[PDB]
Amino acid sequence: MKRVLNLGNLSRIVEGDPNEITDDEILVIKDKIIEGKIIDIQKRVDGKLVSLITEKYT
Amino acid sequence: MKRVLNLGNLSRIVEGDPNEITDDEILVIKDKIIEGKIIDIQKRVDGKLVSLITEKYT
Amino acid sequence: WTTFVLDNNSTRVVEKVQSRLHSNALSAGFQFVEYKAPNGVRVRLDVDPFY
Amino acid sequence: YNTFSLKLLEDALYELSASKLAMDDRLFVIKTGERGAIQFHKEVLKTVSGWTTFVLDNNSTRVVEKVQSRLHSNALSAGFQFVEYKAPNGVRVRLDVDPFY
Amino acid sequence: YNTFSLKLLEDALYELSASKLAMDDRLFVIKTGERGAIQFHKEVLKTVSGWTTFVLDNNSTRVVEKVQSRLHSNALSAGFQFVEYKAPNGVRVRLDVDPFY
Amino acid sequence: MVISINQVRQLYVAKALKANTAALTTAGDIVPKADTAKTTLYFQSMSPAGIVASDKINLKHVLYAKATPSEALAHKLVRYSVTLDADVSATPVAGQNYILRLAFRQYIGLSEEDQYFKYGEVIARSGMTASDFYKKMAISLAKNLENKTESTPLVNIYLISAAAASTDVPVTSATKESDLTATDYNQIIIEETEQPWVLGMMPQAFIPFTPQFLTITVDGEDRLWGVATVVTPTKTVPDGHLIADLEYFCMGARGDIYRGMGYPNIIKTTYLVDPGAVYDVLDIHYFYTGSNESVQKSEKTITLVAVDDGSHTAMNALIGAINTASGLTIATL
């Protein structure tokens, strides 16, 4: 049960502007409707932000 | 833009078995079919291991 | 400054105190009163009550 | 050049050094102006920001420092500058900011 | 090989060591060029990236160190190279760069 | 152009053809002379200083006699066709810096260790196109390779429009994206350029190059964006400069070896090769063997160079002459 990643790459998990995060940072987005949920986790792929979580379908 | 959690609470973001995930640690389920993507972020509440990502439909 | 990690060991923003309620007594608090910018441009601050 | 990077001069310096210099003698003392010294700092930083296999503690970098003040008992500074780089195989980089530039 | 894997090399050297060498006498020097040293550095780097249990701090590694300059008081240098890998049961791996390569 | 000799080499410029020793009026007139009983061959040439003959050739001791055309000596210039890898990405990346590297192999010094690298950098942008990227890349190379301050010419760089597909669009250090008005640019050609030349001091040489690329992060992995490919050449350096040095060299066997040593006290040699021409060459290898013990061969060469009007008339006439006088057969080119 090892950490998913090291701390130098977990340290860069931040909260705030989608425009100001570099390629080295992971972006979190706290859901505003619910009080303790998450709505998306993003990191820059090619200058664009993309969700790390796989999209689900029926 | 600032860090989302103190590194103490980020060092407890782990990769393992859902049956061994207690509280004071968050779980990440990596995806197999896709390399970098993630499946779900999970956090135990009352013995059950619930997700922090809000379900999104069409 | 996500690159660097700020540790109390060098900042002492959570200091140890000689208290009476405990053997490991802590005191918190810090202030940024200064900033060093590239190429010598160092901004001290002065607080004057006239302001 | 029109857009400057550290990848760029790191490659240039090394290819020259591999072809022409020996490992011990690959030190390069660049001469430039303050406005390139800051460009250097920026790019060296942008390069170090990708070193996630390392955590840069302030106890060794001292980017933040403890200073005396009457406003507080733990009064803190902040600020750093990158003035060197060490590419592999002995390639070093050092600066000499000359006002003539 | 097409893509150098230190995982492949680590197994090969140990399996050979277990079958053929004592605990000592397991220093595996490697003669190669300068670019192989780069490949070695990269792969050693990528493996210590999976050591999520361990935390690489600059206070011991010194990838970013303090240098004296005249542009800033907290002037910083940067850079490092991975030259050796020490594997289970005394299976060392050292590099010997030869210009002949 | 110092060369290797099989114990001697000698050159005669066949400017004209006269058919008689009497008609040798002006320099460069040459006549092949062989008796009816075809046992010897030589050439009566008119020198700047009078008639002169060449060593006699025993038609029994001739090894090979062959004519080489002008195009055989025309160095085709190596030209690459660098494009970006449709595998990595058929288009540029939004925020990546593409740094193309041209490592030059034989720079000032002779050795392959005398290396020299020139770069072309282009930081891509969202919405950037491939044509627009080739545009900027070629312009960067121009500023670095086709500049005016460079000590020596290094390469020529061009652009090709898919509509044209054969026409190469020059891109010099003066060019600018306003002058390059197209949207279907496919590639960047990088061609080899002719180096300078001096008679007897700077032989006709070249400096070759290979294009190398640096690695970009395309998704999360360092990868190379370009594929360098060699396409058929279309430019050729003509023979005029080689023959001239050949004459500057091979005339020191028939004459003065102190070409210029002793500046006031020297003997100037007038030459008949104009480096602004294209000559077809003809070489005959032969030897002399002695008597009863001196059987060791003395292989020798007599070369004749004639200007090509485009169809090899001077040489073909010269060939017919030597073949009808010597019984030889030298395969008119």
Distance CA D31, CA D101 (A): 9
Q: How buried is residue F329: exposed, middle or buried, by Cβ count under 10 Å (0-12/13-18/19+)?
A: exposed
> What are φ and ψ of residue D62, in 5° steps?
50, 40
Ramachandran assignment for E37, one of left (phi > 0), alpha (psi -120 to 50 degrees), beta (any other):
alpha
Q: Which two tokens stand for residue F167?
A: 């026409």
Place of tokens 């502007």: A17
Token code pair at residue E74: 């907290």
Alpha carbons F116 and F28: distance in angstroms, whole number: 44
* CA D52 – CA A3 distance, rounded (Å): 14
Which residues in chain D have their CB less than 8 angstroms from residue F214's CB? 7, 11
Inspect the interface and report whether the beta carbons of D74 and C31 lie closer than 8 Å.
yes
Query: String of b and e for A20-52 (b: at least 16 CB within 10 Å)?
Result: ebebbbbbbbeeeeeeebbbbbbbbbbeeeebb
Rounded Cα gap, residues C30 and D76, in angstroms: 7
**Chain F closest CA to A48's CA: distance in Å?**
8
Q: Is the Cβ–Cβ distance between F132 and F105 less than 8 Å? A: no
Task: Give how far Cα A26 sits from Cα of C7, E55, F222, F227, F295, Å.
Answer: 21, 19, 19, 33, 88
* F95–chain A nearest CA distance, Å: 6
User: Which of F5, F3, F10, F64 is closest to F304 using CA atoms?
Assistant: F10
Residue F149 burial class via C-beta count within 10 angstroms: exposed 0-12, middle 13-18, buried 19 and up: exposed
Encoding tokens for residue D91?
């390639």
Interface test with A, best of E48, E51, E52 (most A CBs within 10 A): E52
- Residue F146: in which H helix or E strand, if any? none
Q: What angle do CA F173, F176, F179 make, to 5 degrees?
A: 125
3-state secondary structure of D89: coil
Phi, psi of C16 (to 5 degrees): -95, 140
- Whether F48 contacts F33, CB under 8 Å: no
Q: Which chains touch E (3 or more CB pairs under 8 A)?
A: A, C, D
A24–chain C Cβ distance below 8 A for any pair: yes
Taking each helix axis as running N to C, give the angle between helix D34-48 and helix D6-20, from 0 to 180 degrees, rounded to the nearest 10. Answer: 90
Contact F85, F187 (CB under 8 A): no
Taking the Cβ of residue D22 and every Cβ of chain F, the question of whether any pair is shorter than 8 Å is answered with no
Report the structure determination method: cryo-EM
DSSP state of F225: -
Contacts of E73 in chain C (CB under 8 A): 36, 42
Chain A residues closer than 8 Å to C2 by CB? 11-12, 14, 22, 24-25
What's the CA gap between B5 and E53, in Å, rounded? 19
Which candidate, A50, A27, A31, places its Cα nearest to that of A39? A31
Handedness of CA E1, E5, E7, E10 (dihedral sign): positive
D48 and E41 Cβ atoms separated by less than 8 Å: no
Q: Is A12 on the interface with D (CB under 8 A)?
A: yes
- Rounded Cα distance, F194 and F192, in Å: 7
Burial of B6 (0-12, 13-18, 19+ CB in 10 A): exposed
**Which two structure tokens, joined as six digits, stand for A24?**
């080295």
How many alpha carbons fall within 13 Å on the CB side of residue C42? 13
What is the crossing angle of helices E6-20 and E34-48, to 10°?
A: 90
DSSP assignment string, chain C: --SEE--HHHH-SEEEE--SS-SSEEEE--EE-EEE-STT-EEE----TT-
Could you tell me how many CB contacts below 8 A there are between chain A and chain D? 20
How far C11 CA sits from the closest chain E CA (Å)? 15
User: Is beta strand D29-32 parallel, antiparallel or unpaired with respect to D92-97?
Assistant: parallel
Residue F223 contacts residue F84 (beta carbons within 8 Å): no
* F175 Cβ neighbours under 8 A, 6+ residues apart: F139, F142
Those residues whose C-beta lies under 8 Å from the C-beta of residue E53, and which sit 6 or more positions away, are: A2, A3
Which of F31, F37, F42 is CA-nearest to residue F300? Answer: F42
Q: How many CB atoms lie within 10 A of CB F326?
A: 22
Size of interface A-C (CB pairs under 8 A): 7
Report DSSP state, residue F295.
-
Paired residues of F213 in beta bridges: F100
The sign of the CA dihedral E43, D48, D52, E62 is positive
For residue D21, the distance in angstroms to the closest alpha carbon of chain C comes to 31
> D2 to each of D47, F139, F144, how far by Cα in Å?
19, 11, 11
Of the candidates E30, E5, E26, E29, the one whose C-alpha atom is nearest the C-alpha of residue E16 is: E26
CA distance D6 to E12: 37
Query: Does the distance separating the beta carbons of F117 and D15 come in below 8 Å?
Result: yes
Per-residue DSSP letter, F246: H
Helix residue ranges, H only, chain B = 7-10
**Whole-angstrom distance, CA of residue F269 vs CA of residue F256:** 8
Contacts of B17 (CB under 8 A, 6+ apart): A1
d(CA D14, CA D26): 8
Q: Do D11 and F113 touch (CB under 8 A)?
A: no
What SS3 state is found at F106? Answer: coil
Amino acid in the structure at residue F316: N
Tell me the structure's resolution in angstroms, rounded to a single decimal. Answer: 3.0
The continuous run of DSSP H or E covering D37 comes out as helix D34-48
**How many whole angstroms separate alpha carbon A17 and alpha carbon B1?**
6
- What phi, psi does F188 have (nearest 5°)? -125, 115
Least Cα separation, residue D42 to chain A (angstroms): 14
Q: Cβ–Cβ of A12/C5 closer than 8 Å?
A: no
Residues of A whose CB is below 8 A from E51: 6
* Distance in angstroms (rounded) separating the CA atoms of residues D25 and D63: 31
Q: What Rg value do the Cα atoms of chain F yield, rounded?
A: 27
SS3 (DSSP) at F89: coil
CB atoms within 10 A of CB F198: 11
Question: Could you tell me the two tokens for C38?
Answer: 């590239």
C-alpha of F160 from chain center: 25
Nearest by CB: E77 against D37, D55, D86: D86
Beta strands in E1-101 (DSSP E): 27-32, 64-66, 75-78, 85-87, 91-97
Alpha-carbon gap, residue F67 to D54, rounded angstroms = 71
| CB burial readout E1-38, b (16+ within 10 A) else e | eeeeebeebbeebbeebeeebeeeebebeeebebeebb
Query: A3 forms bridges with which residues in the sheet?
Result: B14
Joined together, the tokens standing for residue E101 give: 């390569």
The position carrying tokens 């008597």 is: F291
Q: Which residues contact F75 (CB under 8 A, 6 or more apart)?
A: F204, F206, F236, F237
Query: What's the number of CA atoms in the CB half-sphere (13 Å) around residue A23?
Result: 17
Q: Are D2 and F113 an interchain contact pair (Cβ–Cβ within 8 Å)?
A: no
Q: What are the residues facing F188 on neighbouring strands?
A: F82, F159
Tokens 């992060």 sit on residue: F217
> Which among A36, A33, D39, C6 has a CA at the least distance from the CA of B2?
C6
3-state secondary structure chain A: CCECCCHHHHCCEEECCCCCCCCCCEEEEECCCCCCCEEEEEEECCCCEEECECCCCC
How far apart are the C-alpha atoms of F279 and F13, rounded to whole Å? 9
State the residue for tokens 């390629």.
A23
* Chain pair A-E, CB pairs under 8 angstroms: 14
Rounded (10°) CA dihedral F37, F41, F45, F49: -100
**Structure-block tokens of residue B8:** 């103490």
With CB atoms and an 8 Å threshold, state whether A54 touches B36: no
| CA dihedral over C27, C33, C36, C37, signed as positive or negative | positive
- Render the burial of D68-94: b for 16+ CB within 10 Å, e for the rest: ebeeeebbbbbbbbbbbbebbbbbbbe
Distance from CA of E60 to the nearest CA of C (A): 15
Query: Any idea of the CA torsion for E7, E8, E12, E15, to the nearest 10 degrees?
Result: 50
Distance between CA atoms of E37 and F122, rounded to whole angstroms? 29
Name which of F36, F17, F39, F42 is nearest F28 in CA terms: F17
- Minimum distance, in Å, between the CA of residue B55 and any CA atom of chain A: 9
Q: Which of helix, strand or coil describes residue D5? A: coil
- Nearest residue on chain D to F220, alpha-carbon basis: D50
Find out whether A53 and B53 touch, Cβ atoms under 8 Å. Answer: yes
Distance, C-alpha E15 to centroid of its chain? 20
